């Protein structure tokens, strides 16, 4: 993994994230939503679990993005939890949780769940 | 379970659901959101898995409610997945998914996730 993870990944919606997997489990990078302007880049940080393991299992990892930068503040944060599978067709399959900050009455509807698959292509 | 499940349950938000657990896994009832008016009752249907099992495990079950009745159409449906634990303090602990019907562009944000615990009291 690690080496394999470092790089640019694209998801089916048109978002791109560039990440560096450091030697001791760290994931650091930026996530850009669209257009191709600075205004869409957000910091991301996460961790990955290096095993990794002798039977081709994927590498579990997760990262977070708080949707605040110098151009936008969306009062929310998303976490992606998934695994990295390398090889010819390497991908990161994830499920994500997007929570928005609410008042206590609306707290019951503050989190959206979804999924994303990221590829190098 | 079954016998134990049949009855009225209340959740921490003030919603009530009355359900009948039939001999062969069926769950049928109504869910009422608030006020205490017919306008807040919706049909619910689900299934429960009778085991049940010799080591005190809970009874898995799930049900669905489409938020449409003769007074309201919220173009959405919620499914609750959880387990029933009986006894002195019987409860049904669940995690739920609420999906609203969207256009294909907004499909990524069509499902909210939450949790609910229902008691007989």
């Amino acid at each position: 993994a690690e080496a394999g993870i470092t790089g640019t990944w694209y998801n089916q919606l048109g978002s791109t994230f560039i990440v560096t997997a450091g030697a001791d489990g760290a994931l650091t990078g930026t996530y850009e939503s669209a257009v191709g302007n600075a205004e869409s880049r957000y910091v991301l940080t996460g961790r990955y679990d290096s095993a990794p393991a002798t039977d081709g299992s994927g590498t579990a990892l997760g990262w977070t993005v708080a949707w605040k930068n110098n151009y936008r503040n969306a009062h929310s944060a998303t976490t992606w939890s998934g695994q990295y599978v390398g090889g010819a067709e390497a991908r990161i399959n994830t499920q994500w949780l997007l929570t928005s900050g609410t008042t206590e009455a609306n707290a019951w509807k503050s989190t959206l769940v979804g999924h994303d698959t990221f590829t190098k292509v | 379970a079954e016998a134990g499940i049949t009855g009225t349950w209340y959740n921490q938000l003030g919603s009530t659901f009355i359900v009948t657990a039939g001999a062969d896994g069926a769950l049928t009832g109504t869910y009422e959101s608030a006020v205490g008016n017919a306008e807040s009752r919706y049909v619910l249907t689900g299934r429960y898995d009778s085991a049940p099992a010799t080591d005190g495990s809970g009874t898995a079950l799930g049900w669905t409610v489409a938020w449409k009745n003769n007074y309201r159409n919220a173009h959405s449906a919620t499914t609750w997945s959880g387990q029933y634990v009986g006894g002195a303090e019987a409860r049904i602990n669940t995690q739920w998914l609420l999906t609203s019907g969207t256009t294909e562009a907004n499909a990524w944000k069509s499902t909210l996730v939450g949790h609910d615990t229902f008691t007989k009291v």
Binding site: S15, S33, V35, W67, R72, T78 | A105, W108, K109
Partner: peptide, 8 residues
């Protein structure tokens, strides 16, 4: 137009 969707 939440930053996690397209575009924005």
């Amino acid at each position: 137009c939440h930053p996690q969707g397209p575009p924005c």
